[PDB]
Symmetry: D2
Subunit: 325 residues, 4 copies
């Protein structure tokens, strides 16, 4: 589709969390032994828009930030890397920015100590969601964790409605954070509802299991038979080293491959995947190639500071992928 | 439709609030001057199932009640009037039953002092919603106020999904209680979502305005043009003394009329309307006649202790309706 | 003491809860079977000031009431029985009045279903406690339940300080309501602190056990040896049918007796006891006689609508007391 | 006093907060521009016991820590510097450790972005306060911020009672953190109550103003005339560069002096003051000398990593103090 129904200024606008990541400087050790932390912007939709801007996409953001040095850093950083920050709203009720402290015990053992209670990003409200902003974009990227609590949950539902009625493609990134939710069945309720309304849904197989209210691994053919009764036209299901699979409502299926990588830290793999996959799609590369872009970007981010197009393309050309799994 | 896809034991199962109403014995005065109150079961879906049982329908209920004398009264009363109470769940966290104290200053000035914070009915959770129960019913009656807070909101969303996949007709009663919600836009978000999933939607024009996120009276033709893009096959829009209008997806429209009445107290008019309207529909009377049943029952309940079929039919035969408005 | 250090307009000012009692009309049955309830003002300090006014004392009140028909009833009723309501403050944050529904299964089995969460009376704050009001009184009556939550707890602590520095006698009524507190040790912390600051302490033996952080019945001689290291000059310890004992810092002890009574409902016994005991003390009758006044009033209130001086005195003259226990 | 009524194993046990401080590595800039933070144990009573151990005192601690890497770091660090951690209790309800991010705009402009809501240290409860532990100490150090919320507030009140009845000296460090409290009058209520029960009270003049419920600077002679009606035998009032003053119930007064210092960061000045002042007192140096120890330690901590006895003594000998203010 080489021209759209309306003129678009943004490639994507994401909605939900922009927070602080505090990354362990001394790593491959228990966090108790980590004495210094480096400050970064984090949060799945924030990471996706920052990664997208690094690839040259024009990105915007709908989210709530704290009225303090952490919120001002997040705004200044995003603006400095070329993300539009016009629709970042400053919380006026004393709410703090969420914090993720990262522990890297080894390449295979990484985890986050999260400060998530009553954080500013969860107080984004429907009245702060602007139709005039959303309609200037090709895509609306919705992250699942933004559905974990009201009023953010209703702000997201409002955003999706406004996107759909302005011919803005709704991309749902499943982004599962179990400790942000009360129960997995609660997660299933909102994930199913939102996926059914969305145009593109991207998640791991485990995340689709949650969506479907399952406690055991589901079958991709059943997943898509279900969701293709509803709005989605494209469903991307990721299986880590077993690769990734994209399915279209027209009945085609495409396969992507994990890249061989010297892993340092696995955080951010999924946000790098989404940004590069969407970049490829928006850039006319087609689904099969888009899967390589997402996979290559994921590999670079965990071994590196988000990937450049040049780094992604060099890794794709080198073509050292995993096919044995 | 004179036999269904599966055998049904219940005419309707309602989900949401069963609480205590404390009705002013000395009335036509400020509640400050009311010295005695009579105890009744209240709550919109409770009233609808109690009214339905009085008409001879077989009714069930999904709701949470307090572990105390008020909860036990509600269970015993509903059971005693022939409602199935097998899926009433007793709250084990110390939550109290909601309370409505009624003030009747005059026939034209009635209001409720409500105790609604952290009440037991709002803690109904998805894990307490049983598919095996729902599938034994012709209809699932969902009241709007049950969407006002989690976990009840997710329990209702789960119930609707289970109803739909078991060929149980979803009836959404808009039941608007503004003080149960944070903002009208929040109400619009959930009302729109739920109405779009429902088979039958019943509400006042003001309630549809809320659903549509409007602050001014909407146009019924626009309302139905919207909802008939989605699941509903029947939409009933009530306008008080100006009557009521039912619209079908096939493109038919039917009109009902308010009955002339010596009003005592307006509480319960809407629940009497829904129970008698649904009774008529279930009983094969057709939509135009069903509107008369709902209107006649509404009139009797505010002038009377829920109506009998005989009282409703006598009032319909007498045919003293309002057409001047 | 027949004239005081400053002129006094009030005999007592009480601080804490004024709420609604809903008394079962059909009684000697489970509340499930009680269909009608009569509305009264309740709450221990409210009852004490209403009872005091009925005896002819001049009483005032420091408390917070709801901005609704229940709060306005409480103000109008107290004012109508001669209590000063100038320092009742209206809650502006939507908090409801506490509610006590009374169950009378039999004379020997009475209990309350309480609505106590986030009630208006608990939001009385230090800024709403007026030194100019307190200093116009002979006595400040503090009820223990007002210490159960902030900000009421700090309002009470402020009131006590202001009383003491204006030569206003602090009377601490132990008024134990376990479900208003998180743990008994928490109750002990605040009860001990407040009793140590008070001039007169009145409670049941069980209430003093709570004060002392004991789970077994304590010894009155040990209780008073403890508290007489601190502020109290008079300690009254009640033992139901075994009578009541008052102890002075000077080392005297006095005994009172329960009155034989045809019990209907035991609620309010303690508030009737405190009001009549204080009336007798204020009226120069001395401690031994004051114990008879408290006991007689307790008997009348549970068999009856608060006692008159004439009813109390007639019962004392009749002298049908319990001495066998 | 060269031998005590009972044998003592600890010089001091402190009660309240042990948390994480995240200190700006790149400083003399807005925190937005600070990219790296170093992890330390913080919290006023924690700092006081860590500083005390560095001076060679035997210290213990009563506090609650998170069940995570931050709580385990705090325990391991305190233990590693010789503080007894036997009465650190691990929170089992998912509460996080408080966090202080430090901003150093310049030597004269330092501030903290605090994460303080529902933090683990505030859930220390009376049942977790052990009399057998407290009685093994010479002193109990109570920090004011531990009174800011229940259940910590009641745990502290319990600790003070147990200290007093075991001849353990109660030292109240006023430690004022306004954003931990609802209102200054609330702070005054608890600070006044606790100071009245304490043996030694240490605070800035501004902190005593808060204690006294004043919004303007108070007069030390009035402050001590008040508190010397109650338990204190020693009151230390600090005035920054104008020095510090200690007053005894016997009627003596002593003056201390601020040390000239190249200030880097003012955090921790007060905790260094308290630890070194108490060290001097415990070590028989007398009050006038103890004031020099507190002042010298304060100077070193803000210009430096807590002071050694040797560093403190060298600074005292050098005797470069401020007397012009």
């Amino acid at each position: 589709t080489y021209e759209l129904s309306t003129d678009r200024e943004f490639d994507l606008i994401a909605i939900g969390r922009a927070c602080i990541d505090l990354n362990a400087v001394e790593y491959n050790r228990p966090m108790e032994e980590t004495m210094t932390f480096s400050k970064y912007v984090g949060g799945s939709p924030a990471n996706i828009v920052i990664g997208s801007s690094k690839l040259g996409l024009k990105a915007g953001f709908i989210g709530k930030i704290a009225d303090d040095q952490h919120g001002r850093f997040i705004e200044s950083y995003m603006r400095g890397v070329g993300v539009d920050t016009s629709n970042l709203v400053v919380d006026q009720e004393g709410h703090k920015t969420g914090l993720a402290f990262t522990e890297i015990k080894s390449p295979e053992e990484c985890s986050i100590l999260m400060y998530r209670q009553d954080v500013a990003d969860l107080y984004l409200s429907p009245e702060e969601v602007n139709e005039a902003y959303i309609r200037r974009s090709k895509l609306l990227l919705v992250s699942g964790t933004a559905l974990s609590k009201s009023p953010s949950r209703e702000a997201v539902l409002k955003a999706i409605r406004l996107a759909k009625r302005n011919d803005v493609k709704v991309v749902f990134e499943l982004d599962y954070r179990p400790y942000s939710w009360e129960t997995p069945e609660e997660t299933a309720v909102y994930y199913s509802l939102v996926a059914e309304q969305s145009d593109i849904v991207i998640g791991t197989r485990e995340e689709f299991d949650v969506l479907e209210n399952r406690t055991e691994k589901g079958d991709n053919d059943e997943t898509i038979r279900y969701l293709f009764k509803h709005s989605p036209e494209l469903i991307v299901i990721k299986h880590g080293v077993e690769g990734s699979f994209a399915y279209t409502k027209a009945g085609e299926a495409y396969r992507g491959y994990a890249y061989k990588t010297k892993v340092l830290k696995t955080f951010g793999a999924g946000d790098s995947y989404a940004s590069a996959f969407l970049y490829a799609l928006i850039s006319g590369k087609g689904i099969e190639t888009a899967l390589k872009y997402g996979s290559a970007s994921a590999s670079i981010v965990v071994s590196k500071a988000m990937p450049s197009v040049e780094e992604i393309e060099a890794l794709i050309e080198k073509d050292e992928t995993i096919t044995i799994a």
